[PDB]
Chain A
Amino acid sequence: QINTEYAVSLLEQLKLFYEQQLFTDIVLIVEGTEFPCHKMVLATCSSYFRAMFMSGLSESKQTHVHLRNVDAATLQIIITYAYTGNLAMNDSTVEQLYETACFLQVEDVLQRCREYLIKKINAENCVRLLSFADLFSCEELKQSAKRMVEHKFTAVYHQDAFMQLSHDLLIDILSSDNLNVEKEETVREAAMLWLEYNTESRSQYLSSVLSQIRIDALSEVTQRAWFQGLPPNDKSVVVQGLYKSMPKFFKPRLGMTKEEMMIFIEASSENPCSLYSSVCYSPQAEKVYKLCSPPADLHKVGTVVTPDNDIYIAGGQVPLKQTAFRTVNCFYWFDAQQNTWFPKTPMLFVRIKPSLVCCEGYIYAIGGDSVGGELNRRTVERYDTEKDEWTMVSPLPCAWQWSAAVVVHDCIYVMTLNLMYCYFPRSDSWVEMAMRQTSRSFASAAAFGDKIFYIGGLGSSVTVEIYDVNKNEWKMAANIPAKRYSDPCVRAVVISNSLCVFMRETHLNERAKYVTYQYDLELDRWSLRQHISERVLWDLGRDFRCTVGKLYPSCLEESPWKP
């Protein structure tokens, strides 16, 4: 191999020459700023300077080149990267950095900024990044922007930059089958408002934008509104659209295929190839669709589903390369369509079984057996979904183990064996709450409306303690009617605007039975909503978690397994 010591010595000597200006022969003249540099470094880094000097043109012998349509700071950072390899990339100058990299055709900085932008893609810059990837040919960025823009924009459709988009880009966006919309009318009104941004600059594109939307809205309202905005005496558009909507037979999209499903993690691996797997139950389809394995079989993790219906994974441990397990603070995000876990910004401290709770767009991970274990062994930390970073919050006053947390009334409610503390995000403080009369642990709670339903606790039992958040009082309702000589595995969840329970029971010398019940809020009784047949759902285990979310049956595949 090439001697790295001599390579770094040569590089540092060249950078010293650059700083001291000894062997510089070519000077870059940009907006009156002198940039003394060498030809060898520029040729090695950029693919434009190699064609600027070794070309035989008038600049081959000229020692002063007036490089135009560039920026001084961008050129300076590119030159210093070419001379030392350090590329300091902030969150603002990456746009002009990519512009100058494409202008100068430098592959290394182009790849680096492409990776930075593939990491930086978020909701508030999705349309801007897609427009940038359309301006400069970049297929990876274009595809990532396609996916993220489709999802987040069809969720939001309010960005100001969406109005200033090319016709081809909008045709690609609207005609795609990856849009995430609960209805087919929101895309219609989004297209209408985009068209009405201008009057005559969009008339020619009117015949094309309607060609990608289904005819179910091409004969109903929002056709006379276009006639109102039609240019005067234009008889080539009204009669055109009058007899035009014959083709494009109505085909349902993919965004209207989200159903309230119970996502399960760390289930019993049907085939023992892996230690565990992830499955999901369909309360409506009455089937069990398989889910992608956790990233690097990440066990002992926590789940959260934001009000925007997004799944996240935090904490967990990976078997170190017989008992062998090491805890890692890696963070991941689940793609609802690609059926894969996209990595995100990792946490600061590793966790085991963390309680992920979403509130005000922030992901809160409370506790989880941190590696610190110092005076503040109860330190909790939130995540920024806008800036893609983690921020510490007010620590929990008391150290708790095997706890659960929910969000009610824009506040974090973490529950332990007998104590409860409410966190105020506005003031970053903890307030003492009501005290339970029973010592129970290893249970889960579901936030339904303005009440907290702590179900089960210790196997578990059928004890239920309902907490009225407004009345600040713990009260008993009833006990779930189960079987004798049985160990039920209770799982509290909210589904169909009602509090249902996923309770798996096992009898003596008998296999586990799956059945869910609907708890009557006013009657204080668990009614049999549906019985899960064992012909579709097999054993899941004991350390499995359940959460409420929506998934697409089309993108996912049915798990092939014998009843």
Chain B
Amino acid sequence: QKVDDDRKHEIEAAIVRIMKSRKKMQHNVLVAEVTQQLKARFLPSPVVIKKRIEGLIEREYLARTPEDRKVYTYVA
């Protein structure tokens, strides 16, 4: 459980550190990049990352609206 939470923060920190200076995704564009960056770390765990990326929509700092995908909120 502890290492699962470790992976949970490891993916979120990477996605908030990298995607602030990159482009946006439509359906499954940036997930490939985030899995490649963590390819040497552990398994991609597609279901876990898919379930966790959609939890940040509840507030600011790149809410990643399931509506607008063309351009993301590159604001802070």
Contact = CB atoms under 8 A, between A and B. Distances in A.
B70 interface: yes
A433 to B, nearest CB: 8
Contacts of A220: none
Nearest to B23: A424
Nearest to A409: B33
Contact of B24 (A411, A426, A432): A426
A429 B21 contact: no
- Chain A at the B interface: mostly helix, strand, loop or mixed? loop
Nearest to A428: B71
B24 A427 contact: yes
Contacts of B24: 424, 426-427
Interface in B46-76: 70-72, 74
| Interface class of chain B by DSSP | loop
A187 B29 CA distance: 34
Interface string B5-22: 000000000000000011
A427 B36 contact: no
A411 B33 CA distance: 14
B22 A431 contact: yes
A472 B21 CA distance: 10
B23 A411 contact: yes
Contacts of A428: 71
Contact of B37 (A411, A429, A470): A470
A426 B23 contact: yes
Contact of B74 (A425, A429, A470): A429
Contacts of B37: 470
Contacts of B70: 426-427
Contacts of B21: 431-432, 472
B64 to A, nearest CB: 13
A538 B34 CA distance: 50
A270 to B, nearest CB: 47
Interface in A414-465: 424-429, 431-432
Contacts of A425: 23
Interface string B29-46: 100010011000000000
A427 B24 CA distance: 7
Interface in A443-500: 470, 472
Interface residues of B, number: 13
A472 B22 CA distance: 11
Number of chain A interface residues as a range:
10 to 19
A411 B21 CA distance: 13
A411 B26 CA distance: 15
Interface string A113-135: 00000000000000000000000
Nearest to A411: B23
A426 B25 CA distance: 8
A429 B21 CA distance: 10
Of B23, B24, B72, most A-chain CB atoms within 10 Å: B23
A425 B72 CA distance: 13
Most buried by B among A427, A428, A432: A427
Most buried by A among B29, B37, B71, B72: B71
A427 B19 CA distance: 13
A432 B74 CA distance: 13
Contacts of A429: 23, 71, 74
B62 to A, nearest CB: 13
A31 B64 CA distance: 56
Nearest to B21: A431
Given A426-B70, A427-B72, A429-B74, A470 B23 contact: no
A470 B71 contact: no
A370 B68 CA distance: 35
Nearest to A471: B37
A422 to B, nearest CB: 8
Contacts of A411: 23
A425 B26 CA distance: 13
A431 B74 CA distance: 10
Contacts of B29: 426
B28 to A, nearest CB: 13
Contacts of B74: 427, 429
Contacts of A427: 23-24, 70-72, 74
Contacts of B22: 424, 431
Contacts of B72: 427
A300 B22 CA distance: 33
Contacts of B71: 426-429
Nearest to A426: B23
A397 to B, nearest CB: 14
Interface string A251-269: 0000000000000000000
B34 to A, nearest CB: 11
B46 to A, nearest CB: 20
Contacts of A472: 21
A470 B37 CA distance: 8
Nearest to A433: B21
Nearest to A472: B21
A438 to B, nearest CB: 23
A19 to B, nearest CB: 48
A431 B36 CA distance: 21
A429 B29 CA distance: 17
Contact of B36 (A424, A426, A432, A470): A470
16 contacts: A426-B23, A426-B26, A427-B24, A427-B70, A427-B71, A427-B72, A427-B74, A428-B71, A429-B23, A431-B21, A431-B22, A431-B23, A432-B21, A470-B33, A470-B37, A472-B21
CB-based closest 7 A-B pairs: A424-B23, A427-B71, A431-B21, A426-B23, A427-B24, A427-B23, A426-B24
Given A426-B24, A431-B22, 16 more contacts: A424-B22, A424-B23, A425-B23, A426-B23, A426-B29, A426-B70, A426-B71, A427-B23, A427-B24, A427-B70, A427-B71, A427-B72, A427-B74, A429-B23, A470-B33, A470-B36
